[PDB]
Amino acid sequence: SWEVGCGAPVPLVKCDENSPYRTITGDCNNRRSPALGAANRALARWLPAEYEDGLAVPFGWTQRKTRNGFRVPLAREVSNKIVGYLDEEGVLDQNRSLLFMQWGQIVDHDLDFAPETELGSSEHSKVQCEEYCIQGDNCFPIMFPKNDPKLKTQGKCMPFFRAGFVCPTPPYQSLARDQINAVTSFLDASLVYGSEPSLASRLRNLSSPLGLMAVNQEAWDHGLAYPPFNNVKPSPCEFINTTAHVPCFQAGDSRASEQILLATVHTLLLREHNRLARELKRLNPHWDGEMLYQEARKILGAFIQIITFRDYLPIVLGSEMQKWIPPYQGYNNSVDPRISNVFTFAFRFGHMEVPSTVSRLDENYQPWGPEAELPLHTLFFNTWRIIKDGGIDPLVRGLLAKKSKLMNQNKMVTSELRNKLFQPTHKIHGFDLAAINLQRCRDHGMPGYNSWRGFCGLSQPKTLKGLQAVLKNKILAKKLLDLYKTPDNIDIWIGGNAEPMVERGRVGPLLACLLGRQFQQIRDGDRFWWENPGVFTEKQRDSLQKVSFSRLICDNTHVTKVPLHAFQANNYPHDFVDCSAVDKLDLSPWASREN
Ligand code: HEM
Ligand SMILES: *[C@@H]1O[C@H](CO)[C@@H](O)[C@H](O)[C@H]1NC(C)=O
Numbered sequence: 261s262w263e264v265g266c267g268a269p270v271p272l273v274k275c276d277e278n279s280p281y282r283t284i285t286g287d288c289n290n291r292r293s294p295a296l297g298a299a300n301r302a303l304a305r306w307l308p309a310e311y312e313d314g315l316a317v318p319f320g321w322t323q324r325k326t327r328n329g330f331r332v333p334l335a336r337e338v339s340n341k342i343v344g345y346l347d348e349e350g351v352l353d354q355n356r357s358l359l360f361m362q363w364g365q366i367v368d369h370d371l372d373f374a375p376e377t378e379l380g381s382s383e384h385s386k387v388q389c390e391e392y393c394i395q396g397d398n399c400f401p402i403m404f405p406k407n408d409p410k411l412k413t414q415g416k417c418m419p420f421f422r423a424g425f426v427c428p429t430p431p432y433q434s435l436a437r438d439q440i441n442a443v444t445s446f447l448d449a450s451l452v453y454g455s456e457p458s459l460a461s462r463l464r465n466l467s468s469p470l471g472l473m474a475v476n477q478e479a480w481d482h483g484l485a486y487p488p489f490n491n492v493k494p495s496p497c498e499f500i501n502t503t504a505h506v507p508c509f510q511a512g513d514s515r516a517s518e519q520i521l522l523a524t525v526h527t528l529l530l531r532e533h534n535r536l537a538r539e540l541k542r543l544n545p546h547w548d549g550e551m552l553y554q555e556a557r558k559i560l561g562a563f564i565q566i567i568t569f570r571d572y573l574p575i576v577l578g579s580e581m582q583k584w585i586p587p588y589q590g591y592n593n594s595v596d597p598r599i600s601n602v603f604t605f606a607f608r609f610g611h612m613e614v615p616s617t618v619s620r621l622d623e624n625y626q627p628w629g630p631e632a633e634l635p636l637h638t639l640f641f642n643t644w645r646i647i648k649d650g651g652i653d654p655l656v657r658g659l660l661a662k663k664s665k666l667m668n669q670n671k672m673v674t675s676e677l678r679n680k681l682f683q684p685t686h687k688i689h690g691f692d693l694a695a696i697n698l699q700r701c702r703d704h705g706m707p708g709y710n711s712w713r714g715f716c717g718l719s720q721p722k723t724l725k726g727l728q729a730v731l732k733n734k735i736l737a738k739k740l741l742d743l744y745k746t747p748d749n750i751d752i753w754i755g756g757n758a759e760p761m762v763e764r765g766r767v768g769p770l771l772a773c774l775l776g777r778q779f780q781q782i783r784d785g786d787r788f789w790w791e792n793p794g795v796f797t798e799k800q801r802d803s804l805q806k807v808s809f810s811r812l813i814c815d816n817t818h819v820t821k822v823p824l825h826a827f828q829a830n831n832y833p834h835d836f837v838d839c840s841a842v843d844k845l846d847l848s849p850w851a852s853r854e855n
């Protein structure tokens with residue numbers, strides 16, 4: 261409206277047009293508009309941003325500024341009164357493995373990352389934010405309510421820094437603030453390879469023409485690879501236990517070591533690249549470093565898209581899968597592939613799927629050692645428990661044999677995340693992911709629950725009695741309206757997650773609509789979609805159709821007993837078969853005959 265196109269981060273890219281490979285940045289995917297879907301650009305706005313000043317000031321900033329004539333509730337008070345629970349008994353999903361949760365976070369990390377304004381390296385008003393809880397500029401502290409236990413142990417607030425935005429830092433007053441997506445909008449293994457040139461090259465082994473990703477030179481896993489350490493200090497993975505001095509992993513995505521099961525699936529994905537490369541080199545000995553890397557990178561990209569679109573999305577979206585992600589009818593270069601700002605909140609439905617513990621299992625799928633089961637809060641920024649406690653295999657069997665948390669209207673987010681979250685720089689296991697989510701919704705200028713209901717063609721309840729019938733829950737509706745006063749003011753993260761789940765799904769109608777739309781767009785708007793004619797030969801696709809997470813495990817660990825359907829709740833031994841019974845990835849169609 262104001263500027264036709266704002267852009268002062270980086271301008272310079274020529275598009276190869278004849279390349280059979282993606283760029284690292286996601287530039288040049290869309291031939292007409294080559295910036296579309298590329299990293300370090302604004303998140304898309306499906307609806308106009310909603311700030312108290314119309315431009316940048318979040319709702320909740322100014323004590324005397326209402327939203328529609330009512331004060332917005334403190335994020336931590338919504339967390340305390342709606343999101344928390346004590347009893348972990350009976351909270352588990354009887355039909356989703358823990359891998360279902362974990363694949364969600366992997367997928368999320370491929371698609372979106374809104375970094376905190378890291379501009380300010382002098383910036384020691386961290387102290388002003390952390391120690392003194394003074395709201396100002398990029399410091400937007402989560403203030404504790406009266407009656408919060410954390411007030412007795414942790415001071416007045418949790419520190420919270422506003423997200424980075426385009427055009428960029430110390431802003432103007434022209435059109436509304438847009439937060440940055442720092443990774444590629446394409447489902448493209450950017451979490452393995454990186455979304456920028458510096459990092460992508462750092463991760464590569466350029467010491468041999470084999471197109472390998474670099475691997476740890478200090479630790480191994482029964483001959484099997486770990487990712488390189490991040491050697492930059494301070495290291496949060498070091499902070500959590502000095503004695504071990506085990507740093508964080510270096511992977512394509514900065515968040516890889518945030519929890520031990522994310523690091524685990526990252527390690528599996530890195531292993532797969534090197535596995536693929538080796539079999540491609542064995543198959544095509546001529547192929548130089550670059551062709552090996554790119555052909556393996558391109559295979560890993562397709563694996564992620566198939567597991568996500570064939571196995572994962574149908575058991576998230578349930579009855580809504582067909583209404584939003586119909587069967588694929590080819591690349592449409594008019595679709596916007598960019599991740600939307602709202603999607604980055606809709607996809608945090610995952611937060612309610614995280615259980616309170618993580619288990620290491622032995623070969624008989626029984627407890628591994630005397631501390632087999634660990635509280636999740638001890639596993640934030642934890643790589644030492646991988647290297648110095650049995651490696652990947654015990655944690656992968658836990659992923660198969662243990663269950664996700666089920667979303668529950670009276671048991672939303674485990675206290676492991678809601679009271680004990682560790683944030684790098686902030687020293688304590690004392691943060692609230694639910695409160696952060698709600699504060700972030702306001703930071704990003706999110707429209708409220710009823711704007712999104714209207715967007716999705718759903719009823720917009722105006723009364724307690726109206727909200728009760730949509731939530732199918734009188735008490736939850738009462739607690740939300742006591743805090744928010746009007747359903748128009750409910751933050752999209754809590755409103756979306758409050759809805760009962762669609763038949764055969766794990767999200768309610770509103771999230772199904774938002775996630776459905778976004779996943780439709782990243783498939784239909786991707787020139788390198790695995791099923792787009794010319795990306796892969798017909799034979800290559802017939803082979804790719806047979807990938808599975810079970811096969812990924814079989815090839816990249818010493819786990820020989822796996823389930824056929826790894827996202828279902830599977831119990832050992834009834835639901836487990838030998839790896840020999842699990843279809844393989846036939847790489848024979850990648851045979852290149854130069855004569
Ligand atoms: C999606 C998604 C996001 C937003 C990513 C983006 O675009 O920036 C997200 C964020 C976070 C954050 C940052 C919170 C903030 O400052 O706003 C943390 C600290 C965190 C921690 C954990 N999450 Fe998460 N998360 C997203 C999605 C998912 C999903 C999706 C299905 C799962 C599962 C998941 C899990 C976890 C997790 C598990 C133990 C931790 C810790 N997240 N997330
Ligand atoms: C479990 O979920 C799958 C979909 O993942 C479904 O097809 C199957 O019927 C389910 N079994 C149970 C226990 O409902």
Ligand SMILES: *[C@@H]1O[C@H](CO)[C@@H](O)[C@H](O)[C@H]1NC(C)=O
Nearest residue numbers: 465467468470472473474475
């Ligand atoms: C690079 O590859 C060679 C094997 O081909 C290996 O000896 C070396 O350690 C590798 N370096 C890294 C950091 O992966």
Ligand SMILES: *[C@@H]1O[C@H](CO)[C@@H](O)[C@H](O)[C@H]1NC(C)=O
Nearest residue numbers: 500501502503504505644648
């Ligand atoms: C720290 O790591 C050491 C070395 O592995 C381990 O033995 C010890 O129990 C750990 N302590 C904590 C607090 O994690």
Ligand SMILES: [Ca+2]
Nearest residue numbers: 370444446450
């Ligand atoms: Ca990506």
